[PDB]
Automatic annotation (TrEMBL):
Listed Pfam families: DUF1028
This protein's name: Major pilin protein fimA
Gene3D superfamilies: Glutamine Phosphoribosylpyrophosphate, subunit 1, domain 1
InterPro entries for this protein: DUF1028, Ntn_hydrolases_N
Length: 226
């Protein structure tokens, strides 16, 4: 199905993240993985391999350049032509592999702090528009990722969308619309606003994070409890 994904590093904060949308279900579950000790990966294509997504991160942890990590993982797989893989390290270096048996139009665009990839696209300009939107945006990192999904969509239906953002001072921000009949990206933005503002955001800053693993709720009396 129509598929596009973007991985990026946010230099100012050291956050890493990605976002994706497809014309099928559960894109967040299939495609997006990440670890603050490794980088980000997007594993997709006609016959996506969950293994590729996990294993490429291990190669990064173990000191492979993204190009070599992607090549190591894909070369070992006789079915590689039917899938597509992108990976980015903690400093924004990135590489992709695009199998020849994925549906046209395919493949990938690197840019200073990330990588866009996709397949079953209507035009080259889908990935170009995605990249331009991400790099041109002066919004917060998460909104840049959203802007990228919207531009990719506009350059072309989609049924699922997701975002994943990691930072050592924050719990993972994992936001999934696994099915929406007509506008999963819009539904993702709504979820993003709810997940990053008000009571919920106030609660979410009071839980364990990588830099404060034993964090508990704020001390003292409160009239409310999430």
């Amino acid at each position: 199905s129509l598929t596009f994904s973007i991985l990026a590093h946010d230099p100012e904060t050291g956050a890493i993240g990605g976002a994706a949308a497809t014309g099928s279900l559960c894109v967040g579950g299939w495609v997006l993985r990440g670890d603050l000790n490794a980088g980000m990966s997007a594993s997709q294509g006609a016959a996506p391999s969950t293994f590729w997504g996990e294993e490429v991160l291990q190669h990064l942890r173990d000191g492979s350049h993204p190009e070599d990590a992607v090549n190591h993982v894909t070369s070992q797989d006789s079915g590689r032509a039917y899938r597509q893989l992108a990976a980015m390290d903690l400093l924004g270096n990135a590489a992709a592999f695009t199998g020849s048996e994925n549906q046209d139009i395919k493949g990938s665009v690197t840019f200073a702090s990330g990588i866009a990839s996709g397949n079953m696209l209507g035009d080259n300009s889908v990935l170009g528009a995605m990249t331009e939107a991400f790099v041109a945006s002066d919004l917060t990192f998460e909104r840049r990722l959203l802007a990228a999904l919207i531009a990719a969509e506009g350059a072309g239906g989609l049924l699922s969308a997701a975002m994943l953002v990691l930072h050592p001072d924050r719990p993972p921000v994992t936001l999934r619309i696994d099915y929406h009949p007509d506008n999963p990206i819009g539904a993702l933005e709504q979820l993003y606003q709810k997940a990053t503002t008000g009571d919920y955001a106030d609660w979410a800053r009071q839980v364990p994070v990588l830099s404060d693993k034993e964090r508990i709720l704020d001390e003292g009396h409160h009239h409310h409890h999430h």
